[PDB]
Amino acid sequence: SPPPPNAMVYDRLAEAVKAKLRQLENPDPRFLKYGSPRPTLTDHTRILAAPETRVTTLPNGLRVATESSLAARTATVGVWIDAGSRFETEESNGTAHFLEHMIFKGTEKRNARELEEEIENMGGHLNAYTSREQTTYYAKVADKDVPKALDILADILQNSRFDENRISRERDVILREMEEVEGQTEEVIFDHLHATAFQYTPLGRTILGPAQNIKTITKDHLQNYIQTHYTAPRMVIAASGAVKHEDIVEQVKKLFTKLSTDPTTASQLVAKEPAIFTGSEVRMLDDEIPLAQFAVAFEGASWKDPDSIALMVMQAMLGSWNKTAGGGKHMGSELAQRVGINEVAESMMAFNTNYKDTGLFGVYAVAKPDCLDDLSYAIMYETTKLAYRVSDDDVTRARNQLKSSLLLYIDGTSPVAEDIGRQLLTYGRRIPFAELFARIDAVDASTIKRVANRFIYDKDIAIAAMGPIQRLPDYNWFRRRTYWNRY
């Protein structure tokens, strides 16, 4: 009496849908033999073996470390220095960045043109970068030609000279460089955050320095700065790839001389005038901008503080989300799940910055001006739930992720040498892989709760926002959202 199941349009489509759902039903065990979605803690002792890190201090007090591996055809050499933008006087602020830009153009024995043609002819190149507490000059070169690179490095570090017309053209290009740092606003937000969370202390200042100061930066400042802060004990010479420790130490003992021997260590410059975290906010309102950016941050741990490992585990378990990621709404952490399901942001990225004697720990989201309060609510809810009721699968997953990230980042010779230099400046020694793992898997739910109570629970905050932020909750809202009255 009724039509057959094929006579009408909707019946056929319904049958097709049920056919697909049928062909989704039964799985195959042989494709489900080795993997599980439940995190577990596993030991990696039999793969963590790696070559040695020969460190040889010298009678002048200049440490030298190498990670020798004699199968490669390239090597990298550099000079990490324990000086940076923290150690200026607010009347010569950007002197470090200026000195970095200028050290590449003197060297009376070989003029600038000679420098770049020489480095280009062999096929290698060298870089340089600075920060608030470190400065780097490293040369990536071919294995056959390490001694030439070492000679270049020694000469540019020691016998540099500075000229007035050189000064003028460099100050013009640096004024330009300042003029194009304002178009990305992530570094603008972070400069404002660092200059309000650390007001009236050396960490407040910016790396570039005021344009009121870049104009009056003549050679006297450069010479005094290089003779004061570039001393023998505050330098480390590193090298990875295909090198030999004994040759390198030979010509290091031969070429590296004439260094100023000053009795001034970084620790005894940081001991007086330390970093003090206050807690404030800066709200920049423009309203002609389509998107709003803001960051909220507590205080943190030091380099040698034992709790920095737990802080990094926490940052891993408060992960990052982005609108073009493959996770979506299935991304493990609860904060990323809330942001992804409710579509209340463009991107968020928890951060963790360490220093000697202080640190920071925050979130930094970006979103439309009509979802700001929901975003802030979710952010603070998860930030406090860490201190209240941290689970166990979360902690195992976060420990796994931290292990994988830390090891997978080490790849090549530049990362290896950068690791060696940075760690020899911060910890005074290079942490092996085994000790780092044994420290990482020693953080449990109880330790997460304890450290969160120490750092997160009912402490002050620092906020920095920019754009159309007329719907962002005030400071008292954020301050009061650091505890729960139900417990």
């Binding site: 209240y388 009721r389 139900r486 417990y487």
Partner: peptide, 29 residues
């Protein structure tokens, strides 16, 4: 997850009982 919740429930019960013995002050009980 259970222990923290149940401990908080017990302490809230203690608070409720203390409030009750504040509103009423019976020495016969």
């Amino acid at each position: 997850i259970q222990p923290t919740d149940v401990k908080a429930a017990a302490m809230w019960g203690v608070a409720a009982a203390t409030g009750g013995l504040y509103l009423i002050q019976p020495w016969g009980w």
